[PDB]
């Protein structure tokens, strides 16, 4: 069957499954009922219909910023080794 | 001075953001026919 998977994209999108929201991003979405940082458990907020339209617009930035931070965290500008 | 190229290759702005906004509706797919 059909199956598309670019090595560069796969590594970024497949890893977003198990990725906890950093404290830097948590400040954008305060008072979270689950209190969990992993996206898999955080997505439940929208599934439980707890996330209001006003929260939706805020979550968009969080996910986007997280994707960007993950890229830099992989490269690392500071190497102690 | 520090010489670097601001133009990248894979680091391009794609318009396939749909897959990221659909996560607010669907979590785990029941099939992978993509």
mmCIF file with all atom_site columns, N, CA and C in Angstrom, chain A residues 14 25 55 73:
data_model
loop_
_atom_site.group_PDB
_atom_site.id
_atom_site.type_symbol
_atom_site.label_atom_id
_atom_site.label_alt_id
_atom_site.label_comp_id
_atom_site.label_asym_id
_atom_site.label_entity_id
_atom_site.label_seq_id
_atom_site.pdbx_PDB_ins_code
_atom_site.Cartn_x
_atom_site.Cartn_y
_atom_site.Cartn_z
_atom_site.occupancy
_atom_site.B_iso_or_equiv
_atom_site.pdbx_formal_charge
_atom_site.auth_seq_id
_atom_site.auth_comp_id
_atom_site.auth_asym_id
_atom_site.auth_atom_id
_atom_site.pdbx_PDB_model_num
ATOM 1  N N  . UNK A 1 14 ? 7.387  11.895 14.522 1.00 0.00 ? 14 UNK A N  1
ATOM 2  C CA . UNK A 1 14 ? 7.213  10.641 15.261 1.00 0.00 ? 14 UNK A CA 1
ATOM 3  C C  . UNK A 1 14 ? 7.654  10.793 16.714 1.00 0.00 ? 14 UNK A C  1
ATOM 4  N N  . UNK A 1 25 ? 7.372  26.686 28.261 1.00 0.00 ? 25 UNK A N  1
ATOM 5  C CA . UNK A 1 25 ? 6.138  26.685 27.493 1.00 0.00 ? 25 UNK A CA 1
ATOM 6  C C  . UNK A 1 25 ? 4.917  26.559 28.399 1.00 0.00 ? 25 UNK A C  1
ATOM 7  N N  . UNK A 1 55 ? -8.627 28.541 24.763 1.00 0.00 ? 55 UNK A N  1
ATOM 8  C CA . UNK A 1 55 ? -7.444 27.789 25.156 1.00 0.00 ? 55 UNK A CA 1
ATOM 9  C C  . UNK A 1 55 ? -6.797 27.213 23.914 1.00 0.00 ? 55 UNK A C  1
ATOM 10 N N  . UNK A 1 73 ? 17.366 21.627 20.664 1.00 0.00 ? 73 UNK A N  1
ATOM 11 C CA . UNK A 1 73 ? 17.778 20.742 21.749 1.00 0.00 ? 73 UNK A CA 1
ATOM 12 C C  . UNK A 1 73 ? 18.523 19.519 21.214 1.00 0.00 ? 73 UNK A C  1
#
